[PDB]
Amino acid sequence: LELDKWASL
């Protein structure tokens, strides 16, 4: 559910 820190940079 929760996107990672670097989900698009």
Partner: antibody, heavy 132, light 108 residues
Framework: RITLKESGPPLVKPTQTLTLTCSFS??????????VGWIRQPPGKALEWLAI???????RYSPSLNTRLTITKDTSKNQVVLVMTRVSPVDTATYFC????????????????????????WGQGITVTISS | ALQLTQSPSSLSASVGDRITITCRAS??????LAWYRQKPGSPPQLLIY???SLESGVPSRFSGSGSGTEFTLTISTLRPEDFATYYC?????????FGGGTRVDVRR
């Protein structure tokens, strides 16, 4: 060369609080986008992600253990501390801290995020047994 | 951490053999997938990051591919130190997750 090493109590009793310390070298938690995370591995079972903390102090926790975990970093001492409250026998496991790279930058510009897609270096791990 | 199914959970093999391990995710994780090898009594060791990139220092026999919900790790020529447990890890969503692991042992 990056190295991490976990330290803490090898034995803790149920309901007590478990404080684990990750001492590292080869990188700084002031370095751009760098992360240090914690993974545990109950004897014989699979790896389980617990939490991660980044250079900018951004923090994330396993939703299942969120209420019992606190991760903090001490930039100056090159350490990351993970505190797990109210431990129980099911928390007996080998706990590893690991390094996560930040995006590759060129003259200060992140040009590649590929390297953040892994925990590239792990500590030897610390075995913690919870028994009364 | 998140839902990733490795297959097979157990695999028998012999030195020189070519093996592949698959990891399927419950939802697309783009290329944010890492493969690790864990030898008995040691910590996991990064093999492949970002689904197909080879971690420096890791032998070329290892390679990974796939994207979205299907990834594979293949060891072209199994070596003695490759009889271990392999895990995939998704880093696209929090909590980052590991697969259940794939045990690779000596066939007989």
């Amino acid at each position: 060369r990056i190295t991490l090493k976990e330290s803490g109590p090898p034995l803790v009793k149920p309901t007590q609080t478990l404080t684990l310390t990750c001492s590292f070298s080869g990188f700084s938690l002031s370095d751009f986008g760098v992360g240090v995370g914690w993974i545990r591995q109950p004897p014989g079972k699979a790896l389980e992600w617990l939490a991660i903390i980044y250079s900018d102090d951004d923090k994330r926790y396993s939703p299942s253990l969120n209420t019992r975990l606190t991760i903090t970093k001490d930039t100056s001492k090159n350490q990351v501390v993970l505190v797990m409250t109210r431990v129980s026998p099911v928390d007996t496991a080998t706990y590893f801290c690991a390094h996560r790279r930040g995006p590759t930058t060129l003259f200060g510009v992140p040009i590649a995020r590929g390297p953040v897609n892994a925990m590239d270096v792990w500590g030897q791990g610390i075995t913690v047994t919870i028994s009364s | 951490a998140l839902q990733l199914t490795q297959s097979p959970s157990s695999l028998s093999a012999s030195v020189g053999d070519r093996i592949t391990i698959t990891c399927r995710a419950s939802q697309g994780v783009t290329s944010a997938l890492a493969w690790y090898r864990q030898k008995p009594g040691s910590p996991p060791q990064l093999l492949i990051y970002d689904a197909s990139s080879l971690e420096s220092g890791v032998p070329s026999r290892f390679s990974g591919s796939g994207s979205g919900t299907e990834f594979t790790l293949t060891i072209s020529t199994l070596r003695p130190e490759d009889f271990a447990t392999y895990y995939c890890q998704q880093l696209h969503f929090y909590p980052h997750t590991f697969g259940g692991g794939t045990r690779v042992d000596v066939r007989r």
